[PDB]
PDB file of C-alpha atoms in Angstrom:
ATOM      1  CA  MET A   1     108.297  97.395  97.812  1.00  0.00           C
ATOM      2  CA  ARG A   2     106.352 100.566  96.998  1.00  0.00           C
ATOM      3  CA  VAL A   3     104.297 102.382  99.606  1.00  0.00           C
ATOM      4  CA  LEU A   4     101.951 105.297  99.464  1.00  0.00           C
ATOM      5  CA  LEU A   5     101.278 106.938 102.753  1.00  0.00           C
ATOM      6  CA  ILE A   6      98.198 108.929 103.326  1.00  0.00           C
ATOM      7  CA  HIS A   7      97.458 110.967 106.463  1.00  0.00           C
ATOM      8  CA  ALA A   8      93.709 110.758 106.748  1.00  0.00           C
ATOM      9  CA  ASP A   9      90.767 112.159 108.753  1.00  0.00           C
ATOM     10  CA  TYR A  10      89.119 108.780 108.310  1.00  0.00           C
ATOM     11  CA  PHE A  11      89.521 105.591 106.312  1.00  0.00           C
ATOM     12  CA  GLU A  12      86.647 103.081 106.066  1.00  0.00           C
ATOM     13  CA  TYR A  13      86.488  99.910 103.968  1.00  0.00           C
ATOM     14  CA  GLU A  14      84.086  97.166 103.063  1.00  0.00           C
ATOM     15  CA  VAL A  15      85.239  93.812 101.615  1.00  0.00           C
ATOM     16  CA  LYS A  16      83.435  92.977  98.334  1.00  0.00           C
ATOM     17  CA  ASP A  17      84.221  90.014  96.072  1.00  0.00           C
ATOM     18  CA  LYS A  18      87.175  87.750  96.208  1.00  0.00           C
ATOM     19  CA  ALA A  19      90.019  88.511  93.824  1.00  0.00           C
ATOM     20  CA  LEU A  20      91.785  85.229  94.537  1.00  0.00           C
ATOM     21  CA  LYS A  21      90.197  81.856  94.576  1.00  0.00           C
ATOM     22  CA  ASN A  22      91.567  81.268  98.028  1.00  0.00           C
ATOM     23  CA  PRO A  23      91.707  84.532  99.844  1.00  0.00           C
ATOM     24  CA  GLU A  24      92.443  85.259 103.479  1.00  0.00           C
ATOM     25  CA  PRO A  25      89.594  83.937 105.604  1.00  0.00           C
ATOM     26  CA  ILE A  26      87.697  86.532 107.696  1.00  0.00           C
ATOM     27  CA  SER A  27      84.958  86.734 110.324  1.00  0.00           C
ATOM     28  CA  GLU A  28      81.831  88.744 109.743  1.00  0.00           C
ATOM     29  CA  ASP A  29      83.300  91.573 111.782  1.00  0.00           C
ATOM     30  CA  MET A  30      86.438  91.773 109.534  1.00  0.00           C
ATOM     31  CA  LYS A  31      84.361  92.701 106.477  1.00  0.00           C
ATOM     32  CA  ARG A  32      84.150  96.348 107.502  1.00  0.00           C
ATOM     33  CA  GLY A  33      86.482  98.508 109.548  1.00  0.00           C
ATOM     34  CA  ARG A  34      87.019 102.163 110.126  1.00  0.00           C
ATOM     35  CA  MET A  35      89.722 104.321 111.730  1.00  0.00           C
ATOM     36  CA  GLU A  36      90.051 108.050 112.252  1.00  0.00           C
ATOM     37  CA  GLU A  37      93.109 110.283 112.434  1.00  0.00           C
ATOM     38  CA  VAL A  38      95.060 107.562 110.714  1.00  0.00           C
ATOM     39  CA  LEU A  39      98.171 107.084 108.595  1.00  0.00           C
ATOM     40  CA  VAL A  40      97.036 104.725 105.901  1.00  0.00           C
ATOM     41  CA  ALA A  41      99.799 102.639 104.426  1.00  0.00           C
ATOM     42  CA  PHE A  42      99.065 101.399 100.958  1.00  0.00           C
ATOM     43  CA  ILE A  43     101.612  98.734 100.262  1.00  0.00           C
ATOM     44  CA  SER A  44     102.597  97.134  97.003  1.00  0.00           C
ATOM     45  CA  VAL A  45     104.853  94.118  97.669  1.00  0.00           C
ATOM     46  CA  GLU A  46     107.105  93.319  94.722  1.00  0.00           C
ATOM     47  CA  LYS A  47     108.867  90.326  93.242  1.00  0.00           C
ATOM     48  CA  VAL A  48     112.220  91.745  94.331  1.00  0.00           C
ATOM     49  CA  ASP A  49     111.030  91.701  97.929  1.00  0.00           C
ATOM     50  CA  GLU A  50     110.925  87.787  97.771  1.00  0.00           C
ATOM     51  CA  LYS A  51     114.732  87.948  98.308  1.00  0.00           C
ATOM     52  CA  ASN A  52     114.611  89.465 101.762  1.00  0.00           C
ATOM     53  CA  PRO A  53     111.230  89.490 103.423  1.00  0.00           C
ATOM     54  CA  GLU A  54     112.610  90.519 106.825  1.00  0.00           C
ATOM     55  CA  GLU A  55     114.908  93.361 105.722  1.00  0.00           C
ATOM     56  CA  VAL A  56     112.234  94.772 103.508  1.00  0.00           C
ATOM     57  CA  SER A  57     109.710  94.520 106.344  1.00  0.00           C
ATOM     58  CA  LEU A  58     112.052  96.220 108.772  1.00  0.00           C
ATOM     59  CA  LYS A  59     112.620  99.133 106.434  1.00  0.00           C
ATOM     60  CA  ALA A  60     108.897  99.492 105.757  1.00  0.00           C
ATOM     61  CA  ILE A  61     108.195  99.389 109.516  1.00  0.00           C
ATOM     62  CA  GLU A  62     110.690 102.194 110.127  1.00  0.00           C
ATOM     63  CA  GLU A  63     109.744 104.368 107.088  1.00  0.00           C
ATOM     64  CA  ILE A  64     106.064 104.182 108.065  1.00  0.00           C
ATOM     65  CA  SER A  65     106.828 104.803 111.764  1.00  0.00           C
ATOM     66  CA  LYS A  66     108.858 107.953 111.070  1.00  0.00           C
ATOM     67  CA  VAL A  67     106.082 109.485 109.044  1.00  0.00           C
ATOM     68  CA  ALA A  68     103.470 108.626 111.637  1.00  0.00           C
ATOM     69  CA  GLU A  69     105.637 110.183 114.343  1.00  0.00           C
ATOM     70  CA  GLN A  70     106.275 113.185 112.172  1.00  0.00           C
ATOM     71  CA  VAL A  71     102.584 113.676 111.413  1.00  0.00           C
ATOM     72  CA  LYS A  72     101.456 112.764 114.973  1.00  0.00           C
ATOM     73  CA  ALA A  73      99.302 109.806 113.977  1.00  0.00           C
ATOM     74  CA  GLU A  74      98.794 107.201 116.684  1.00  0.00           C
ATOM     75  CA  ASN A  75      96.679 105.114 114.277  1.00  0.00           C
ATOM     76  CA  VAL A  76      98.059 103.265 111.351  1.00  0.00           C
ATOM     77  CA  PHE A  77      96.341 101.094 108.842  1.00  0.00           C
ATOM     78  CA  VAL A  78      98.048  98.564 106.579  1.00  0.00           C
ATOM     79  CA  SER A  79      96.329  97.918 103.190  1.00  0.00           C
ATOM     80  CA  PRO A  80      97.542  95.636 100.441  1.00  0.00           C
ATOM     81  CA  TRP A  81      97.529  97.538  97.155  1.00  0.00           C
ATOM     82  CA  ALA A  82      98.358  96.041  93.764  1.00  0.00           C
ATOM     83  CA  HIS A  83      98.703  99.488  92.212  1.00  0.00           C
ATOM     84  CA  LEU A  84     102.187 100.904  92.745  1.00  0.00           C
ATOM     85  CA  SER A  85     104.066  98.232  90.782  1.00  0.00           C
ATOM     86  CA  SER A  86     104.033  95.888  87.773  1.00  0.00           C
ATOM     87  CA  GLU A  87     106.470  93.221  89.076  1.00  0.00           C
ATOM     88  CA  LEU A  88     104.310  91.908  92.009  1.00  0.00           C
ATOM     89  CA  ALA A  89     105.264  89.149  94.594  1.00  0.00           C
ATOM     90  CA  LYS A  90     103.402  85.834  94.853  1.00  0.00           C
ATOM     91  CA  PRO A  91     100.724  85.901  97.623  1.00  0.00           C
ATOM     92  CA  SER A  92     102.679  83.915 100.195  1.00  0.00           C
ATOM     93  CA  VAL A  93     105.450  86.478 100.099  1.00  0.00           C
ATOM     94  CA  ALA A  94     102.990  89.312 100.021  1.00  0.00           C
ATOM     95  CA  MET A  95     101.049  88.126 103.107  1.00  0.00           C
ATOM     96  CA  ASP A  96     104.289  87.272 104.879  1.00  0.00           C
ATOM     97  CA  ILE A  97     105.601  90.789 104.508  1.00  0.00           C
ATOM     98  CA  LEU A  98     102.235  92.473 105.143  1.00  0.00           C
ATOM     99  CA  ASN A  99     101.900  90.563 108.477  1.00  0.00           C
ATOM    100  CA  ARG A 100     105.502  91.350 109.453  1.00  0.00           C
ATOM    101  CA  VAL A 101     104.898  95.055 108.828  1.00  0.00           C
ATOM    102  CA  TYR A 102     101.623  94.851 110.753  1.00  0.00           C
ATOM    103  CA  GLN A 103     103.251  93.163 113.762  1.00  0.00           C
ATOM    104  CA  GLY A 104     106.281  95.461 113.874  1.00  0.00           C
ATOM    105  CA  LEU A 105     104.052  98.490 113.830  1.00  0.00           C
ATOM    106  CA  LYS A 106     102.158  97.076 116.802  1.00  0.00           C
ATOM    107  CA  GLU A 107     105.496  96.515 118.550  1.00  0.00           C
ATOM    108  CA  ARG A 108     106.312 100.247 117.955  1.00  0.00           C
ATOM    109  CA  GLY A 109     103.201 101.189 119.919  1.00  0.00           C
ATOM    110  CA  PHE A 110     100.709 102.279 117.288  1.00  0.00           C
ATOM    111  CA  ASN A 111      97.133 101.291 117.258  1.00  0.00           C
ATOM    112  CA  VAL A 112      97.289  99.368 113.983  1.00  0.00           C
ATOM    113  CA  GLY A 113      94.479  98.040 111.696  1.00  0.00           C
ATOM    114  CA  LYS A 114      94.563  95.994 108.564  1.00  0.00           C
ATOM    115  CA  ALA A 115      92.581  94.718 105.702  1.00  0.00           C
ATOM    116  CA  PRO A 116      92.222  91.132 104.525  1.00  0.00           C
ATOM    117  CA  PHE A 117      94.361  89.948 101.636  1.00  0.00           C
ATOM    118  CA  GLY A 118      93.090  88.704  98.305  1.00  0.00           C
ATOM    119  CA  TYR A 119      89.773  90.607  97.955  1.00  0.00           C
ATOM    120  CA  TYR A 120      88.284  93.444  95.986  1.00  0.00           C
ATOM    121  CA  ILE A 121      87.516  96.146  98.606  1.00  0.00           C
ATOM    122  CA  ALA A 122      85.416  99.290  98.515  1.00  0.00           C
ATOM    123  CA  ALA A 123      86.808 102.129 100.553  1.00  0.00           C
ATOM    124  CA  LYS A 124      86.429 105.711 101.458  1.00  0.00           C
ATOM    125  CA  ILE A 125      89.048 108.127 102.651  1.00  0.00           C
ATOM    126  CA  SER A 126      89.349 111.794 103.525  1.00  0.00           C
ATOM    127  CA  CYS A 127      92.863 113.001 102.817  1.00  0.00           C
ATOM    128  CA  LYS A 128      94.087 115.839 105.016  1.00  0.00           C
ATOM    129  CA  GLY A 129      95.848 118.170 102.539  1.00  0.00           C
ATOM    130  CA  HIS A 130      98.707 119.463 104.677  1.00  0.00           C
ATOM    131  CA  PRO A 131     102.243 119.224 103.133  1.00  0.00           C
ATOM    132  CA  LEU A 132     103.192 115.826 104.556  1.00  0.00           C
ATOM    133  CA  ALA A 133      99.797 114.245 104.002  1.00  0.00           C
ATOM    134  CA  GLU A 134     100.722 112.196 100.944  1.00  0.00           C
ATOM    135  CA  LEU A 135     104.108 110.621 100.645  1.00  0.00           C
ATOM    136  CA  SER A 136     105.439 107.782  98.629  1.00  0.00           C
ATOM    137  CA  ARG A 137     108.473 105.698  99.457  1.00  0.00           C
ATOM    138  CA  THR A 138     110.330 102.994  97.568  1.00  0.00           C
ATOM    139  CA  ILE A 139     111.963 100.225  99.616  1.00  0.00           C
ATOM    140  CA  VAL A 140     114.473  97.641  98.354  1.00  0.00           C
ATOM    141  CA  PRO A 141     117.116  95.120  99.576  1.00  0.00           C
TER     142      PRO A 141
ATOM    143  CA  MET B   1     103.899 109.378  82.885  1.00  0.00           C
ATOM    144  CA  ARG B   2     102.271 107.305  85.633  1.00  0.00           C
ATOM    145  CA  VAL B   3      98.524 107.270  86.166  1.00  0.00           C
ATOM    146  CA  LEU B   4      96.307 105.756  88.777  1.00  0.00           C
ATOM    147  CA  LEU B   5      92.718 105.425  87.794  1.00  0.00           C
ATOM    148  CA  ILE B   6      90.029 105.205  90.344  1.00  0.00           C
ATOM    149  CA  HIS B   7      86.352 104.524  89.598  1.00  0.00           C
ATOM    150  CA  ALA B   8      84.566 106.432  92.308  1.00  0.00           C
ATOM    151  CA  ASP B   9      81.081 107.004  93.781  1.00  0.00           C
ATOM    152  CA  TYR B  10      82.195 110.548  94.513  1.00  0.00           C
ATOM    153  CA  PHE B  11      85.343 112.647  94.590  1.00  0.00           C
ATOM    154  CA  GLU B  12      85.377 116.029  96.373  1.00  0.00           C
ATOM    155  CA  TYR B  13      88.348 118.336  96.949  1.00  0.00           C
ATOM    156  CA  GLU B  14      89.207 121.554  98.689  1.00  0.00           C
ATOM    157  CA  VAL B  15      92.332 123.595  97.822  1.00  0.00           C
ATOM    158  CA  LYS B  16      94.465 124.329 100.925  1.00  0.00           C
ATOM    159  CA  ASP B  17      97.889 125.999 100.909  1.00  0.00           C
ATOM    160  CA  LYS B  18     100.090 126.680  97.983  1.00  0.00           C
ATOM    161  CA  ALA B  19     102.870 124.192  97.323  1.00  0.00           C
ATOM    162  CA  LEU B  20     104.546 126.417  94.747  1.00  0.00           C
ATOM    163  CA  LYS B  21     105.307 130.043  95.155  1.00  0.00           C
ATOM    164  CA  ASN B  22     103.479 130.772  91.951  1.00  0.00           C
ATOM    165  CA  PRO B  23     100.680 128.325  91.575  1.00  0.00           C
ATOM    166  CA  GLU B  24      97.846 128.242  89.075  1.00  0.00           C
ATOM    167  CA  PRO B  25      95.515 131.155  89.754  1.00  0.00           C
ATOM    168  CA  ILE B  26      91.896 130.254  90.647  1.00  0.00           C
ATOM    169  CA  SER B  27      88.546 131.922  91.314  1.00  0.00           C
ATOM    170  CA  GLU B  28      86.728 131.430  94.572  1.00  0.00           C
ATOM    171  CA  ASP B  29      84.533 128.823  92.925  1.00  0.00           C
ATOM    172  CA  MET B  30      87.585 126.723  91.823  1.00  0.00           C
ATOM    173  CA  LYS B  31      88.642 126.108  95.432  1.00  0.00           C
ATOM    174  CA  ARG B  32      86.134 123.296  95.879  1.00  0.00           C
ATOM    175  CA  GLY B  33      84.612 120.888  93.395  1.00  0.00           C
ATOM    176  CA  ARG B  34      82.780 117.630  93.518  1.00  0.00           C
ATOM    177  CA  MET B  35      81.767 114.953  90.998  1.00  0.00           C
ATOM    178  CA  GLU B  36      79.854 111.711  91.334  1.00  0.00           C
ATOM    179  CA  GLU B  37      80.075 108.471  89.378  1.00  0.00           C
ATOM    180  CA  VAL B  38      83.483 109.546  88.197  1.00  0.00           C
ATOM    181  CA  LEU B  39      86.722 108.074  86.880  1.00  0.00           C
ATOM    182  CA  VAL B  40      89.368 109.969  88.756  1.00  0.00           C
ATOM    183  CA  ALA B  41      92.662 110.195  86.952  1.00  0.00           C
ATOM    184  CA  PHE B  42      95.593 110.760  89.232  1.00  0.00           C
ATOM    185  CA  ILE B  43      98.441 111.769  87.007  1.00  0.00           C
ATOM    186  CA  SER B  44     102.127 111.934  87.738  1.00  0.00           C
ATOM    187  CA  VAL B  45     103.940 113.701  84.871  1.00  0.00           C
ATOM    188  CA  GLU B  46     107.588 112.688  84.625  1.00  0.00           C
ATOM    189  CA  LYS B  47     110.847 114.140  83.388  1.00  0.00           C
ATOM    190  CA  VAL B  48     110.849 111.690  80.482  1.00  0.00           C
ATOM    191  CA  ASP B  49     107.536 113.117  79.322  1.00  0.00           C
ATOM    192  CA  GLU B  50     109.345 116.507  78.556  1.00  0.00           C
ATOM    193  CA  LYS B  51     110.537 114.811  75.314  1.00  0.00           C
ATOM    194  CA  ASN B  52     107.117 114.382  73.777  1.00  0.00           C
ATOM    195  CA  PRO B  53     104.316 116.255  75.461  1.00  0.00           C
ATOM    196  CA  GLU B  54     101.816 115.570  72.666  1.00  0.00           C
ATOM    197  CA  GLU B  55     102.433 111.833  72.191  1.00  0.00           C
ATOM    198  CA  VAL B  56     102.355 111.267  75.895  1.00  0.00           C
ATOM    199  CA  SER B  57      99.138 113.282  76.166  1.00  0.00           C
ATOM    200  CA  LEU B  58      97.526 111.358  73.343  1.00  0.00           C
ATOM    201  CA  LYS B  59      98.311 108.029  74.948  1.00  0.00           C
ATOM    202  CA  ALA B  60      97.036 109.205  78.330  1.00  0.00           C
ATOM    203  CA  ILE B  61      93.838 110.506  76.681  1.00  0.00           C
ATOM    204  CA  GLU B  62      93.222 107.123  75.054  1.00  0.00           C
ATOM    205  CA  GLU B  63      94.213 104.936  78.069  1.00  0.00           C
ATOM    206  CA  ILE B  64      91.907 106.959  80.331  1.00  0.00           C
ATOM    207  CA  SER B  65      89.083 106.971  77.747  1.00  0.00           C
ATOM    208  CA  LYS B  66      89.127 103.184  77.319  1.00  0.00           C
ATOM    209  CA  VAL B  67      88.804 102.604  81.022  1.00  0.00           C
ATOM    210  CA  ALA B  68      86.006 105.124  81.357  1.00  0.00           C
ATOM    211  CA  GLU B  69      84.163 103.468  78.476  1.00  0.00           C
ATOM    212  CA  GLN B  70      84.810 100.071  79.951  1.00  0.00           C
ATOM    213  CA  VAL B  71      83.555 101.099  83.387  1.00  0.00           C
ATOM    214  CA  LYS B  72      80.682 103.240  81.993  1.00  0.00           C
ATOM    215  CA  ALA B  73      81.817 106.510  83.539  1.00  0.00           C
ATOM    216  CA  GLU B  74      80.634 109.635  81.748  1.00  0.00           C
ATOM    217  CA  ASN B  75      82.501 111.798  84.289  1.00  0.00           C
ATOM    218  CA  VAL B  76      86.212 112.084  84.460  1.00  0.00           C
ATOM    219  CA  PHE B  77      88.373 114.118  86.729  1.00  0.00           C
ATOM    220  CA  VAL B  78      92.013 115.007  86.098  1.00  0.00           C
ATOM    221  CA  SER B  79      94.184 115.514  89.242  1.00  0.00           C
ATOM    222  CA  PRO B  80      97.875 116.290  89.338  1.00  0.00           C
ATOM    223  CA  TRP B  81      99.592 113.865  91.702  1.00  0.00           C
ATOM    224  CA  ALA B  82     103.266 113.979  92.656  1.00  0.00           C
ATOM    225  CA  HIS B  83     103.104 110.476  94.108  1.00  0.00           C
ATOM    226  CA  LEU B  84     103.599 107.838  91.422  1.00  0.00           C
ATOM    227  CA  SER B  85     107.145 108.844  90.449  1.00  0.00           C
ATOM    228  CA  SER B  86     110.515 110.164  91.651  1.00  0.00           C
ATOM    229  CA  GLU B  87     111.756 111.701  88.358  1.00  0.00           C
ATOM    230  CA  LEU B  88     109.095 114.495  88.034  1.00  0.00           C
ATOM    231  CA  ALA B  89     108.720 117.076  85.135  1.00  0.00           C
ATOM    232  CA  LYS B  90     109.163 120.826  85.645  1.00  0.00           C
ATOM    233  CA  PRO B  91     105.790 122.617  86.150  1.00  0.00           C
ATOM    234  CA  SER B  92     105.525 124.085  82.663  1.00  0.00           C
ATOM    235  CA  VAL B  93     105.690 120.620  81.170  1.00  0.00           C
ATOM    236  CA  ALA B  94     103.409 119.242  83.814  1.00  0.00           C
ATOM    237  CA  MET B  95     100.670 121.865  83.261  1.00  0.00           C
ATOM    238  CA  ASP B  96     101.096 121.593  79.505  1.00  0.00           C
ATOM    239  CA  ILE B  97     100.407 117.885  79.538  1.00  0.00           C
ATOM    240  CA  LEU B  98      97.679 118.072  82.201  1.00  0.00           C
ATOM    241  CA  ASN B  99      95.776 120.670  80.079  1.00  0.00           C
ATOM    242  CA  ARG B 100      96.257 118.629  76.893  1.00  0.00           C
ATOM    243  CA  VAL B 101      94.837 115.545  78.613  1.00  0.00           C
ATOM    244  CA  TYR B 102      91.979 117.633  80.008  1.00  0.00           C
ATOM    245  CA  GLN B 103      91.098 119.091  76.595  1.00  0.00           C
ATOM    246  CA  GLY B 104      91.332 115.790  74.717  1.00  0.00           C
ATOM    247  CA  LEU B 105      89.040 114.150  77.206  1.00  0.00           C
ATOM    248  CA  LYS B 106      86.511 116.923  76.629  1.00  0.00           C
ATOM    249  CA  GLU B 107      86.869 116.348  72.880  1.00  0.00           C
ATOM    250  CA  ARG B 108      86.042 112.620  73.481  1.00  0.00           C
ATOM    251  CA  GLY B 109      82.718 113.653  75.000  1.00  0.00           C
ATOM    252  CA  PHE B 110      83.188 113.184  78.726  1.00  0.00           C
ATOM    253  CA  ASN B 111      82.069 115.614  81.297  1.00  0.00           C
ATOM    254  CA  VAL B 112      85.544 116.423  82.606  1.00  0.00           C
ATOM    255  CA  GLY B 113      86.676 118.266  85.802  1.00  0.00           C
ATOM    256  CA  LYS B 114      90.063 119.246  87.055  1.00  0.00           C
ATOM    257  CA  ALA B 115      91.985 120.541  89.949  1.00  0.00           C
ATOM    258  CA  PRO B 116      94.332 123.516  90.050  1.00  0.00           C
ATOM    259  CA  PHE B 117      98.056 122.899  89.767  1.00  0.00           C
ATOM    260  CA  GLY B 118     100.644 123.739  92.384  1.00  0.00           C
ATOM    261  CA  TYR B 119      98.609 123.480  95.631  1.00  0.00           C
ATOM    262  CA  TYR B 120      98.232 121.216  98.610  1.00  0.00           C
ATOM    263  CA  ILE B 121      94.653 119.849  98.343  1.00  0.00           C
ATOM    264  CA  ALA B 122      92.404 118.040 100.787  1.00  0.00           C
ATOM    265  CA  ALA B 123      90.171 115.459  99.204  1.00  0.00           C
ATOM    266  CA  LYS B 124      87.711 112.749  99.835  1.00  0.00           C
ATOM    267  CA  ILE B 125      86.868 109.787  97.681  1.00  0.00           C
ATOM    268  CA  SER B 126      84.696 106.695  97.820  1.00  0.00           C
ATOM    269  CA  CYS B 127      86.267 103.927  95.777  1.00  0.00           C
ATOM    270  CA  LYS B 128      83.834 101.459  94.231  1.00  0.00           C
ATOM    271  CA  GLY B 129      85.514  98.072  94.846  1.00  0.00           C
ATOM    272  CA  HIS B 130      84.535  96.202  91.690  1.00  0.00           C
ATOM    273  CA  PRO B 131      87.409  94.473  89.766  1.00  0.00           C
ATOM    274  CA  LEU B 132      88.222  97.330  87.390  1.00  0.00           C
ATOM    275  CA  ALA B 133      87.855 100.066  89.979  1.00  0.00           C
ATOM    276  CA  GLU B 134      91.556 100.695  90.534  1.00  0.00           C
ATOM    277  CA  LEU B 135      93.982 100.484  87.687  1.00  0.00           C
ATOM    278  CA  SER B 136      97.399 101.865  87.133  1.00  0.00           C
ATOM    279  CA  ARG B 137      99.017 102.521  83.787  1.00  0.00           C
ATOM    280  CA  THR B 138     102.508 103.582  82.782  1.00  0.00           C
ATOM    281  CA  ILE B 139     102.858 105.743  79.661  1.00  0.00           C
ATOM    282  CA  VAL B 140     106.095 106.562  77.813  1.00  0.00           C
ATOM    283  CA  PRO B 141     107.425 107.862  74.440  1.00  0.00           C
TER     284      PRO B 141
END
C-alpha cells in the first residue's frame, strides 16, 4: 500500500464518469462532499496487499492516525487513488481495505469522510504548506 | 524519476518557509504564481537519476509533452515534489534536472511555469476529473 497524506484547508470533490463498469453505487448526496481542516488520505492499494488485508489496514489506520494527531486534524478523508503504484489490487481487495481503513479511523474518533470507489472524480484542494503538510508512507506485510 | 501529472483548471501556489538552509533565491514576484488550464508536473527526482541527468530529463520532457498534447494543455507547470520516492537525489542534481525539464518544455512551445526549489509551499489546485486527468509515470536510465 502507498499513501500520500495531505493536510488541507479544504478538500471538495465531485463524482464524474464511471471508471469501472460496475462502480460503487451512490445516492445523489454522495456525488459531492466537502471537508475543511482535513487530513486527506490518498490511498493506492496494491497487489501485495491482497495477502493480508487486515494487517495492511491496521498499519494504514495507525500511520494515518499518528499524522492526524501530530498535525491536529480532527477530520480525515479517505480517497482511493490509482496513482502511487503500478502493481494495483483487484477492486474487491481495494474496497475491502479502503472500508477497513475508513471504519478503523472512525473507531479512533475522527470525523471521517470518503469518496466512492470506481469513478473518475474532479476535486479541489488547498494544501497548507507547513513542514508536515505532505507526507508519503509505504505500508507492507 | 517519478512524476505525477495533473490536468488542472487552475494551480496557484504561495512560497512559505524555507525547507533548506540555502534555498533557491527568488524575487518578491516569484513568491506567488498562478496558471489556468494547466498540466501540472509534480516531479520527484531520485538518486538513480544522478547517473544520467540529461537522458532522464529528455525522457521527462517527452513524457510530459505527450500528455499535454493529448490533453490539449498549452500551459505546463513544473513543481519539485519530495513525495513520490524514498531514494531522493541531492539538491544540485535535483535542480539541474528540474531546470533541464523546464527549458526543454519551453523549447517544445508550451507556456511553462515553475516553482522555486527548497521551500515549503502552500498550494491550491482544481483537478479536472476526466479519464486522463491524473497520470503517473516512472522514468529511469
